[PDB]
Amino acid sequence: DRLLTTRNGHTTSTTQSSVGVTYGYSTEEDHVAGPNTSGLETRVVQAERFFKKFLFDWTTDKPFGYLTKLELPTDHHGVFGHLVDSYAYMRNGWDVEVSAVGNQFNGGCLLVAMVPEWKAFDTREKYQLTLFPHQFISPRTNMTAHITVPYLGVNRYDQYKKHKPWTLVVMVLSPLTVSNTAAPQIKVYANIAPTYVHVAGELPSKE
Amino acid sequence: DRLLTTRNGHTTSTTQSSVGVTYGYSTEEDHVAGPNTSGLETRVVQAERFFKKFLFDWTTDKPFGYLTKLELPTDHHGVFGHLVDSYAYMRNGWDVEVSAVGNQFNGGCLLVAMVPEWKAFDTREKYQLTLFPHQFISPRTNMTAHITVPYLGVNRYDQYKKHKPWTLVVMVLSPLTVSNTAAPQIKVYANIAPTYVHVAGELPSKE
Amino acid sequence: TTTTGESADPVTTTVENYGGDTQVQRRHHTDVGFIMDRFVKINSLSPTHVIDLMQTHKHGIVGALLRAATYYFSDLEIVVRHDGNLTWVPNGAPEAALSNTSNPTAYNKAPFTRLALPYTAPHRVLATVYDGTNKYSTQLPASFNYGAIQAQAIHELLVRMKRAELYCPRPLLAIKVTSQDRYKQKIIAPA
Amino acid sequence: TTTTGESADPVTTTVENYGGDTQVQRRHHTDVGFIMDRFVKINSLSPTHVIDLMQTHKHGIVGALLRAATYYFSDLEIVVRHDGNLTWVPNGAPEAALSNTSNPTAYNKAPFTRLALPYTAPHRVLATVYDGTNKYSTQLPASFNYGAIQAQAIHELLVRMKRAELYCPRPLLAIKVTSQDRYKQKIIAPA
Amino acid sequence: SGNTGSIINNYYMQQYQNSMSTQLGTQNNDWFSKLASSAFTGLFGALLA
Amino acid sequence: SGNTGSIINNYYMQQYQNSMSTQLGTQNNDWFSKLASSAFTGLFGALLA
Amino acid sequence: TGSTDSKARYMVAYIPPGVETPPDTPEEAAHCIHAEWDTGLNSKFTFSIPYVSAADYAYTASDTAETTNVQGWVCVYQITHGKAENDTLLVSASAGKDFELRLPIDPRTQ
C-alpha cells in the first residue's frame, strides 16, 4: 500500500499507487511581503483548491519525445480566475497531481515535469528534461505523479495576463504498450491547486 | 470641529461635520460559526470596503413623507457581488454613510434610517420611523449621517438572491428651503461598506 | 436642556429642571412577557387549521403588540372547542399526517381542550414581516408556524404566547383622530 | 477515508476530513423507549379480543418500528371504549374465563377505560416473526399475546408499549417513490 | 416569568411543560434597556438658579 | 424512562404499576451502541494538508 | 466491485442550492466541496455530505411546490477508467456523527 491523500481547501484527492511527492527548487515560498507591493497585498485562501484539466490521450502511436504542455495559470472559472481579473498583481505556487490510469498490464513510461520559463525544446534537449522538478508514471508501478513547486520569477509579484512562470509538461519517454489484458489507451488528467495565493492592486469595476 | 474619518479596507472617508455614529440594535455581531454551516464558512475581508450609490435629489417640492429606499444588498460589481454568485450562503452587516451637501444657508431636515425586514409604510406610520436605527441631516448642522448595523434575521446565514434583511431609507422630515445664498438643490449619496463578510457553500462554475 | 438633536442620542429631561420631584414608577403592566401572556382569539377557522400568530387581529392588544415587533419567539397554549377528536402535528409535517391518531390526539372532553405546545419551527426566531424578493425554491415563509390542528369541526380557537421574546420594535398606531382635539368615547360609569 | 469494505467493519467519516466542524447532536426523539411510548390504535375488534401487537398497522410509527425489530419486550396500557363491563384475562387463560367477574373487570365509566397491564407471556421475550417449520403439538405462536378482553361491545382499542426493549433490527421502508427525483407531498403551511 | 401566579411547583417536568433553549457562545442582551438608561439627563451649559 | 414527565412519585407501588424483571447471572448490553462507537473515524494512509 | 485488472478514478461533489441544474462535468463541479479517489487495495471510500443550510434544521419531507431540491445535490463522476467497462460501484448511506432527527410524526396512510 502506497496511499496518499492530499487536501487543498474543501477539496481532497487520494491515490493508492503513490510514489511520493517531488518538491522543486525549494520546500517553501520566499517572502510574500516585499517592497514592491508596499503593505497592500493580501492572501486569498478561498482560491486554494483543486481545479481540473484534461491533458491528452496516451496512445500506442505516440513515440518518444511526444510532448503536451500546459502553461500556468490557465483559464480558470472559479475564484482564482476572478482574482486575475480583479487585481493588478499576483503570486502563488502550484500543487500538481497528474493521473494516467490504464491497468497493470500496460507498459511504457511518461515523464511529468514542471518547467520555469518555457521554451520549445529540441529533440536533443528532451534527453535532459529531468533537470527540472519531475516524476515518472509507469503502469507497472503507479497511476499518479505529484509535484509541488513555489512561486518564482524576476519579479516578486506578477501580471499573469502578460507572463506565465510555470508550465506543466508530460512527455512520452517509452511508448505505451497494450495486450489483450491491457487498457487500449490511457487518458491523462491533471488535478491542480494554486498555493499561497496573494494579490495586490485592486482594479476598478467594469460597470 | 467635528471630524471623523472612517476606514474600511483600503478605502477611507472623512467628514468635517460629523454628528457621530449611530449603532443599531447591537454593538457587535452574534456568532458567525453556528451549526447551520457546519464548520465550512470563511470570512472574506477583501469584500469589506466602501462602494457607492446615488439616492435622490432633495428639492424644495418634495414634502414631508417623501421617501427613498435602498434594499441591501444592492447590485454590486466588485468582490462582494462576485461572492453572491459564488457562494450559496452569506452574512454581513453594514457600515453606512449618507452625505447631503448643500450649504449652511439651506434649511430643512432629512431622516436617515436602517430598517430590518422592509414593508411599505403608511403615512401615519412614518411618524414613528425613529423607532429604527437613525440619524438626521439638517444643513444648519451637518452634511453627513452615519449608521452601523449588524447582520440579523430568522436564519443565521442568508440567500441574498431570495431575501434582503436590511434596507436604507432617507425621508424628508421638513422640506428643503433655499434662498439667494443657498444651494438650489441637494443631491443625496450613500457610501456603504459590508462588514464581517462570511460565506459558505461553494457553487459550481458556469463553464 | 438643549442638545445636538441630529445625533439622535437619547435625551430624557425631568421635572427637576424647573424645581419638581421625579416620582416612583412601577412598570409591571408594560412588561413584554407579562402583557403577551393572555389568550387571544383566531377568527378564521376550518376543520384543518395551521396555527399562525399573524391570523391574530391587528388591533387586539396581543396582535397590535406582536406586529410592533420584527422578530419574536415563544412557546404556546391553545384552547380549542371542537367536535370529535383533536389532532395536532408539528411544524414541517405532511398535511396527511393529521388523520393519524399517534400524533398528539385529544379525545373529546367538554367543554373544550386546553393544551401546552412547544415552539417547533426550524428557525432560531420568527418574523412578523419578511422582505423576500420571493423566498421560494406581503407573504410570509410557510415555515413560520406552530404546527396544525384537525377535528371534525373547529368552532373556536384561542391562542396564548408563553415565554415571549420581542425584538426590533415597529410602529404601533392609536385610533385615527377626526375630532378637533381629542378622540372621545363612552367610558364606563355607574348608572 | 478508504478501507477494506468486504470486512463490513463500521466506518464513520466526518466533515473534518475536508475542513468542517462536526456539531452537537441531541437524539432524544430516536430513543427506543421514548418513541414506542405512545398510544396506537388496533382497527379490527370484536366483543372478545385477544391483545396482539401485530394487529397494529404496518405503516404507523409504532407498528413500523416494532416490525423493524425481531424480538421485543414491554408492559402495556390500553384504552377501551366499550358497552357494559370490561373483563381482562392473562395469557394462557381459557376463553371461557372471560365471562367471570373475578378476573380484572372494569365497570363501565364514561367515556372509556384506561388500564395498566403487565407483560404476561411464558417467554423471556416475544417475536414479530417466527421461523417455525410448524410450531405445533406466516403464522405466530398462539402464546405471543398480552391476554384478552371482553365486553358487550368493543368500539375502540388503543394500546401503549411501556418500558419497551427492541432486539435485532429488520428492514424499515419509506414510501415507494414514483417521481423522477423526490417523493413530494403537501406540507402544512399557513393560509 | 410573566402572568403566572401559582405557588405550587409544576406537576410536569420542565422538558415537557416547555421547549428547551440551547446556547452557543437568558443574559442581559436587552438593547433597549441599555439605550434608555444611557439617555442624557443633565443640562448642557451653565446654570443660574 | 421514556415519555413520562410527571414530577410526583407514583401513588401505586412498583410491583403493581409494572411487571417485575428477574435476573440470572438493566446493564450495558447495548450491542448497537458498542457497534456504532467502534466505527473507524480516522484516515487510512498518509496525509498532505 | 471490479476485477483486479480493472482500474478507475472517481469524484463525488456536493452541489449546494443556488444553481438551477447540477453540472454534468467534473471541471464545473471542481469548484464545489469534492473528493476524488482511485481504485486499489482498499475497495471502499466514504464521504460526508455536510449540512449547509439557512435554517438550523431542514424538513425531511418535500413539498409539492418545490421545483429545485432545497438542500442541493450530490454528483458522482468518473474521471477515467482502464478496462473497467461493465464494472460496478456499490453505493450506500449511513448517519454521520452529528446526524439528528427531531419531532416525531405518524404520516403514512392507514
Side-chain angles (χ1 to χ4, degrees):
Chain A
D1 67 66
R2 290 139 41 217
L3 262 115
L4 210 224
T5 140
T6 294
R7 177 181 146 235
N8 278 113
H10 302 319
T11 71
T12 61
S13 175
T14 121
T15 340
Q16 299 191 58
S17 65
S18 176
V19 104
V21 177
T22 291
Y23 289 90
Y25 303 138
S26 186
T27 260
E28 25 211 333
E29 296 279 318
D30 64 356
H31 213 191
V32 306
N36 68 300
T37 54
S38 300
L40 289 339
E41 76 288 338
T42 61
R43 161 108 116 110
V44 22
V45 132
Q46 289 81 11
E48 306 174 353
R49 19 168 43 252
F50 282 119
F51 65 91
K52 306 168 195 308
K53 203 80 175 191
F54 169 69
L55 261 25
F56 77 109
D57 288 322
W58 188 16
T59 58
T60 52
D61 56 283
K62 299 192 175 62
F64 156 63
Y66 181 88
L67 173 164
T68 300
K69 68 171 173 67
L70 180 68
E71 293 177 36
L72 270 2
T74 188
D75 286 307
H76 194 287
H77 301 288
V79 345
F80 183 87
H82 179 71
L83 254 24
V84 180
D85 290 324
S86 311
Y87 297 85
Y89 303 97
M90 291 181 68
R91 63 169 284 157
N92 67 275
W94 301 106
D95 188 31
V96 179
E97 192 180 34
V98 173
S99 59
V101 14
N103 79 183
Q104 63 276 252
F105 299 114
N106 278 107
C109 177
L110 293 175
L111 171 76
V112 9
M114 288 292 286
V115 183
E117 311 299 352
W118 202 71
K119 193 196 94 303
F121 292 107
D122 265 44
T123 111
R124 290 188 72 208
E125 300 181 313
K126 290 178 180 182
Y127 285 72
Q128 302 183 24
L129 248 44
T130 47
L131 286 177
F132 297 107
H134 69 278
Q135 219 173 63
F136 306 88
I137 296 182
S138 297
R140 66 151 25 225
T141 297
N142 64 136
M143 302 192 290
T144 299
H146 195 322
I147 306 168
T148 305
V149 297
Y151 170 82
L152 39 62
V154 305
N155 297 134
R156 201 172 324 268
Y157 273 69
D158 215 348
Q159 298 173 96
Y160 292 148
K161 238 113 110 147
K162 290 144 136 264
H163 174 258
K164 289 169 165 51
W166 287 103
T167 133
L168 168 64
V169 345
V170 180
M171 192 168 86
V172 170
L173 218 33
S174 197
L176 178 72
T177 64
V178 313
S179 73
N180 301 112
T181 52
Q185 57 156 220
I186 293 178
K187 304 182 80 73
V188 182
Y189 289 90
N191 194 206
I192 306 161
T195 60
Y196 301 91
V197 179
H198 292 76
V199 303
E202 298 98 284
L203 291 177
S205 70
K206 291 63 184 156
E207 197 62 4
Chain B
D1 67 66
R2 290 139 41 217
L3 262 115
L4 210 224
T5 140
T6 294
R7 177 181 146 235
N8 278 113
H10 302 319
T11 71
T12 61
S13 175
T14 121
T15 340
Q16 299 192 58
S17 65
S18 176
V19 104
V21 177
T22 291
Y23 289 90
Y25 303 138
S26 186
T27 260
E28 25 211 333
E29 296 279 318
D30 64 356
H31 213 191
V32 306
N36 68 300
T37 54
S38 300
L40 289 339
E41 76 288 338
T42 61
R43 161 108 116 110
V44 22
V45 132
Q46 289 81 11
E48 306 174 353
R49 19 168 43 252
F50 282 119
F51 65 91
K52 306 168 195 308
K53 203 80 175 191
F54 169 69
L55 261 25
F56 77 109
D57 288 322
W58 188 16
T59 58
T60 52
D61 56 283
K62 299 192 175 62
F64 156 63
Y66 181 88
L67 173 164
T68 300
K69 68 171 173 67
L70 180 68
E71 293 177 36
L72 270 2
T74 188
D75 286 307
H76 194 287
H77 301 288
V79 345
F80 183 87
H82 179 71
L83 254 24
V84 180
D85 290 324
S86 311
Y87 297 85
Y89 303 97
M90 291 181 68
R91 63 169 284 157
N92 67 275
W94 301 106
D95 188 31
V96 179
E97 192 180 34
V98 173
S99 59
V101 14
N103 79 183
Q104 63 276 252
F105 299 114
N106 278 107
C109 177
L110 293 175
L111 171 76
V112 9
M114 288 292 286
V115 183
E117 311 299 352
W118 202 71
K119 193 196 94 303
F121 292 107
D122 265 44
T123 111
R124 290 188 72 208
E125 300 181 313
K126 290 178 180 182
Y127 285 72
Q128 302 183 24
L129 248 44
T130 47
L131 286 177
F132 297 107
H134 69 278
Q135 219 173 63
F136 306 88
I137 296 182
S138 297
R140 66 151 25 225
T141 297
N142 64 136
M143 302 192 290
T144 299
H146 196 322
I147 306 168
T148 305
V149 297
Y151 170 82
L152 39 62
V154 305
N155 297 134
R156 201 172 324 268
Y157 273 69
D158 215 348
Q159 298 173 96
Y160 292 148
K161 238 114 110 147
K162 290 144 136 264
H163 174 258
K164 289 169 165 51
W166 287 103
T167 133
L168 168 64
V169 345
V170 180
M171 192 168 86
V172 170
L173 218 33
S174 197
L176 178 72
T177 64
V178 313
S179 73
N180 301 112
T181 52
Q185 57 156 220
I186 293 178
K187 304 182 80 73
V188 182
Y189 289 90
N191 194 206
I192 306 161
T195 60
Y196 301 91
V197 179
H198 292 76
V199 303
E202 298 98 284
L203 291 177
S205 70
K206 291 63 184 156
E207 197 62 4
Chain C
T1 323
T2 63
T3 57
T4 292
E6 295 86 343
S7 71
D9 290 323
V11 184
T12 300
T13 58
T14 65
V15 295
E16 276 80 357
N17 274 14
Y18 49 82
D21 228 286
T22 289
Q23 310 289 301
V24 161
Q25 40 80 66
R26 289 177 228 259
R27 295 183 178 168
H28 316 269
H29 295 346
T30 50
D31 173 78
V32 172
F34 171 82
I35 200 67
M36 304 308 277
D37 200 356
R38 62 230 324 125
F39 283 108
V40 50
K41 96 177 312 176
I42 298 300
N43 279 305
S44 65
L45 300 173
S46 16
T48 295
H49 183 92
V50 176
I51 307 176
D52 165 17
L53 268 27
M54 290 310 279
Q55 285 155 354
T56 225
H57 185 111
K58 70 177 171 186
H59 292 325
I61 185 172
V62 176
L65 266 20
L66 175 65
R67 271 162 251 251
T70 305
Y71 307 103
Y72 67 93
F73 166 88
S74 91
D75 273 338
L76 203 78
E77 280 202 12
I78 64 173
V79 171
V80 188
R81 200 171 120 242
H82 56 92
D83 283 336
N85 303 336
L86 183 77
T87 295
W88 171 84
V89 146
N91 175 303
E95 188 179 290
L98 252 355
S99 309
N100 298 315
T101 266
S102 276
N103 298 116
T105 297
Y107 274 58
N108 199 95
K109 181 172 169 73
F112 39 64
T113 300
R114 213 231 256 229
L115 252 35
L117 298 170
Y119 177 88
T120 236
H123 315 284
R124 61 200 182 152
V125 109
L126 294 178
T128 59
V129 52
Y130 188 79
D131 192 37
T133 309
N134 21 50
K135 114 273 161 55
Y136 262 94
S137 18
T138 180
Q139 187 66 160
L140 248 28
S143 50
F144 292 12
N145 66 72
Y146 283 76
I149 54 177
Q150 185 174 283
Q152 277 178 205
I154 297 184
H155 307 302
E156 200 171 357
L157 172 62
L158 302 183
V159 115
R160 210 213 261 227
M161 294 174 95
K162 305 301 295 176
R163 318 203 286 118
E165 291 170 9
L166 262 29
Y167 307 80
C168 311
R170 310 201 137 234
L172 213 210
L173 260 10
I175 218 270
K176 154 103 87 56
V177 181
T178 278
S179 209
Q180 203 72 235
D181 47 12
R182 266 173 281 152
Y183 175 65
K184 304 197 264 283
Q185 63 192 125
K186 194 193 195 312
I187 292 180
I188 62 173
Chain D
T1 323
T2 63
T3 57
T4 292
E6 295 86 343
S7 71
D9 290 323
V11 184
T12 300
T13 58
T14 65
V15 295
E16 276 80 357
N17 274 14
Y18 49 82
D21 228 286
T22 289
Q23 310 289 301
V24 161
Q25 40 80 66
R26 289 177 228 259
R27 295 183 178 168
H28 316 269
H29 295 346
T30 50
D31 173 78
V32 172
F34 171 82
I35 200 67
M36 304 308 277
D37 200 356
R38 62 230 324 125
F39 283 108
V40 50
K41 96 177 312 176
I42 297 300
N43 279 305
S44 65
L45 300 173
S46 16
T48 295
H49 183 92
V50 176
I51 307 176
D52 165 17
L53 268 27
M54 290 310 279
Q55 285 155 354
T56 225
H57 185 111
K58 70 177 171 186
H59 292 325
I61 185 172
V62 176
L65 266 20
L66 175 65
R67 271 162 251 251
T70 305
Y71 307 103
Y72 67 93
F73 166 88
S74 91
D75 273 338
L76 203 78
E77 280 202 12
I78 64 173
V79 171
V80 188
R81 200 171 120 242
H82 56 92
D83 283 336
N85 303 336
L86 183 77
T87 295
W88 171 84
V89 146
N91 175 303
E95 188 179 290
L98 252 355
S99 309
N100 298 315
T101 266
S102 276
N103 298 117
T105 297
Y107 274 58
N108 199 95
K109 181 172 169 73
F112 39 64
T113 300
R114 213 231 256 229
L115 252 35
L117 298 170
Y119 177 88
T120 236
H123 315 284
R124 61 200 182 152
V125 109
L126 294 178
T128 59
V129 52
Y130 188 79
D131 192 37
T133 309
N134 21 50
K135 114 273 161 55
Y136 262 94
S137 18
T138 180
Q139 187 66 160
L140 248 28
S143 50
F144 292 12
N145 66 72
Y146 283 76
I149 54 177
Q150 185 174 283
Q152 277 178 205
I154 297 184
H155 307 302
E156 200 171 357
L157 172 62
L158 302 184
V159 115
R160 210 213 261 227
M161 294 174 95
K162 305 301 295 176
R163 318 203 286 118
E165 291 170 9
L166 262 29
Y167 307 80
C168 311
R170 310 201 137 234
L172 213 210
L173 260 10
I175 218 270
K176 154 103 87 56
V177 181
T178 278
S179 209
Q180 203 72 235
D181 47 12
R182 266 173 281 152
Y183 175 65
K184 304 197 264 283
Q185 63 192 125
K186 194 193 195 312
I187 292 180
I188 62 173
Chain E
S1 186
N3 200 211
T4 278
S6 41
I7 276 305
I8 281 63
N9 188 19
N10 212 258
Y11 181 84
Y12 296 97
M13 306 180 318
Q14 205 205 318
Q15 62 198 262
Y16 273 86
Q17 188 69 234
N18 294 98
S19 57
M20 303 285 303
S21 302
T22 65
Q23 314 292 334
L24 56 45
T26 181
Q27 286 155 71
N28 200 159
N29 156 59
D30 193 327
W31 179 251
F32 287 91
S33 192
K34 295 195 193 90
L35 199 58
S37 299
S38 88
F40 178 57
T41 279
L43 201 101
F44 210 116
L47 184 251
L48 249 211
Chain F
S1 186
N3 200 211
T4 278
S6 41
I7 276 305
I8 281 63
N9 188 19
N10 212 258
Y11 181 84
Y12 296 97
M13 306 180 318
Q14 205 205 318
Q15 62 198 262
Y16 273 86
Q17 188 69 234
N18 294 98
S19 57
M20 303 285 303
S21 302
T22 65
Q23 314 292 334
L24 56 45
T26 181
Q27 286 155 71
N28 200 159
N29 156 59
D30 193 327
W31 179 251
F32 287 91
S33 192
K34 295 195 193 90
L35 199 58
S37 299
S38 88
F40 178 57
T41 279
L43 201 101
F44 210 116
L47 184 251
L48 249 211
Chain G
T1 263
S3 50
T4 314
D5 61 324
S6 291
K7 293 181 149 160
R9 182 152 200 109
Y10 306 100
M11 170 177 159
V12 53
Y14 168 57
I15 291 77
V19 98
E20 288 171 352
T21 55
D24 24 48
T25 255
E27 289 84 6
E28 300 169 83
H31 306 288
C32 297
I33 291 170
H34 73 267
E36 237 184 66
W37 74 101
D38 67 12
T39 256
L41 190 76
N42 287 168
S43 66
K44 187 176 174 179
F45 175 79
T46 299
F47 178 82
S48 289
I49 302 175
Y51 175 89
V52 180
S53 189
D56 281 359
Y57 284 95
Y59 292 160
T60 49
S62 195
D63 185 59
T64 46
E66 292 171 19
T67 313
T68 267
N69 185 241
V70 169
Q71 291 312 308
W73 311 270
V74 166
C75 291
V76 188
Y77 305 90
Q78 178 189 270
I79 303 300
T80 355
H81 75 101
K83 254 247 182 306
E85 309 84 16
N86 296 330
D87 280 306
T88 263
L89 191 65
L90 286 164
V91 9
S92 53
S94 56
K97 290 292 181 182
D98 56 6
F99 184 74
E100 184 191 314
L101 257 6
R102 36 120 68 166
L103 278 17
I105 198 72
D106 188 21
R108 297 274 238 125
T109 292
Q110 300 167 56

